[PDB]
Amino acid sequence: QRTVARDITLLECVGKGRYGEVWRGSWQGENVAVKIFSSRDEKSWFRETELYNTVMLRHENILGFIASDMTSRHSSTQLWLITHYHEMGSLYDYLQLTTLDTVSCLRIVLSIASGLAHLHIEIFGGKPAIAHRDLKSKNILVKKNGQCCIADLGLAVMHRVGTKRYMAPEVLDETIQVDCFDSYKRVDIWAFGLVLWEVARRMVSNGIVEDYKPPFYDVVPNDPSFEDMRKVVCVDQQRPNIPNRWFSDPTLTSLAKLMKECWYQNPSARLTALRIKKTLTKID
Ligand SMILES: COc1cc(-c2cncc(-c3ccc(C4CCN(C)CC4)cc3)c2C)cc(OC)c1OC
Numbered sequence: 001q002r003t004v005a006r007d008i009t010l011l012e013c014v015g016k017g018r019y020g021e022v023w024r025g026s027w028q029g030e031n032v033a034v035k036i037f038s039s040r041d042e043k044s045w046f047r048e049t050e051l052y053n054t055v056m057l058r059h060e061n062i063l064g065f066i067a068s069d070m071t072s073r074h075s076s077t078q079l080w081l082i083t084h085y086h087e088m089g090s091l092y093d094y095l096q097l098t099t100l101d102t103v104s105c106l107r108i109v110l111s112i113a114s115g116l117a118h119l120h121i122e123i124f125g126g127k128p129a130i131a132h133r134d135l136k137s138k139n140i141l142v143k144k145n146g147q148c149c150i151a152d153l154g155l156a157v158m159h160r161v162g163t164k165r166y167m168a169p170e171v172l173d174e175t176i177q178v179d180c181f182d183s184y185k186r187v188d189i190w191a192f193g194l195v196l197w198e199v200a201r202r203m204v205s206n207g208i209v210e211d212y213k214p215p216f217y218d219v220v221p222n223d224p225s226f227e228d229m230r231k232v233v234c235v236d237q238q239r240p241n242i243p244n245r246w247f248s249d250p251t252l253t254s255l256a257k258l259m260k261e262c263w264y265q266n267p268s269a270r271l272t273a274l275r276i277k278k279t280l281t282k283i284d
């Protein structure tokens with residue numbers, strides 16, 4: 001009655017980590033990305049699979065779902081997540097050697113805000129509200145059209161811990177209002193402001209650009225502890241540096257203001273993803 005072609009050819013490993021591996025694969029001539037989960041990270045496969053079984057997200061700035069596969073092996077289960085493949089790789093990867101102009105910088109950050117607002121918003125008749133809980137430049141992919149997409153819903157919550165470098169102050173000091181879904185949106189907004197800072201640094205103005213650095217590179221170790229982050233973010237209340245050269249450029253002046261309004265200690269003071277979108281559409 002019909003053939004169900006399930007063979008995927010795994011062509012090259014494009015990522016290896018505590019999570020397992022990501023491969024470029026081929027299905028029926030077409031590139032796909034295949035995340036093979038470590039035993040360490042099986043719950044991330046279950047969480048993302050449960051979310052996609054609840055709501056089939058479809059948005060240009062969310063990494064496109066194709067399949068969740070569980071295959072029985074002699075003595076183990078193998079768990080694969082299959083998505084669209086973005087050959088340019090992660091934003092983290094891309095910013096290491098690429099500099100940006102005003103148009104490309106804004107297109108990148110507005111695309112991320114668009115994806116994030118789509119996750120956060122409840123739609124009736126639709127989708128539940130979703131918080132990501134691990135937003136960072138390695139969890140954002142660059143598309144050939146200059147927009148990005150948000151990846152990895154293995155920690156997402158619908159209405160493993162986040163990456164410590166990107167944790168909001170209320171996560172580090174354990175004051176987060178865990179029974180208020182809005183709390184999780186506000187944690188994502190903090191992380192978004194860090195991502196905005198990482199991107200803005202790579203935008204050229206008046207022949208000047210900063211080298212790629214991760215958030216807090218100048219105040220925590222290469223592999224920071226939870227306590228390292230708490231002392232910087234909560235006790236001393238440090239924030240990422242805004243270079244003087246940004247204040248000669250109208251785009252970077254507006255982006256500095258925006259990232260400041262993602263980093264308030266008081267989570268309820270931070271901008272919403274929808275407000276960030278509106279602000280970004282009025283820059284330049
Ligand atoms: C099981 O596993 C995998 C399957 C596939 C795949 C391969 N060919 C065809 C299909 C297909 C889609 C949809 C229907 C519909 C037709 C309409 N009718 C109302 C009910 C059924 C039938 C068949 C699929 C889903 C790809 C895979 O990987 C890319 C799979 O592995 C993860």
Ligand SMILES: COc1cc(-c2cncc(-c3ccc(C4CCN(C)CC4)cc3)c2C)cc(OC)c1OC
Nearest residue numbers: 004005027028030031032065066067068082083084
């Ligand atoms: C998982 O992913 C991919 C799947 C497929 C694919 C293969 N066979 C059949 C289908 C299909 C056909 C028909 C229906 C519907 C149509 C209307 N109504 C009557 C209900 C049934 C659904 C599904 C698809 C979608 C192709 C893909 O790429 C070209 C996929 O992406 C990698």
Ligand SMILES: COc1cc(-c2cncc(-c3ccc(C4CCN(C)CC4)cc3)c2C)cc(OC)c1OC
Nearest residue numbers: 014022033034035081083085086089138139151152
């Ligand atoms: C963050 O998370 C996930 C990401 C992906 C994913 C999707 N498209 C493409 C990629 C990719 C391709 C190529 C490179 C390299 C190749 C070497 N070159 C020198 C630089 C570029 C990097 C990255 C990935 C990693 C899939 C996922 O799941 C299936 C992810 O997990 C949710």
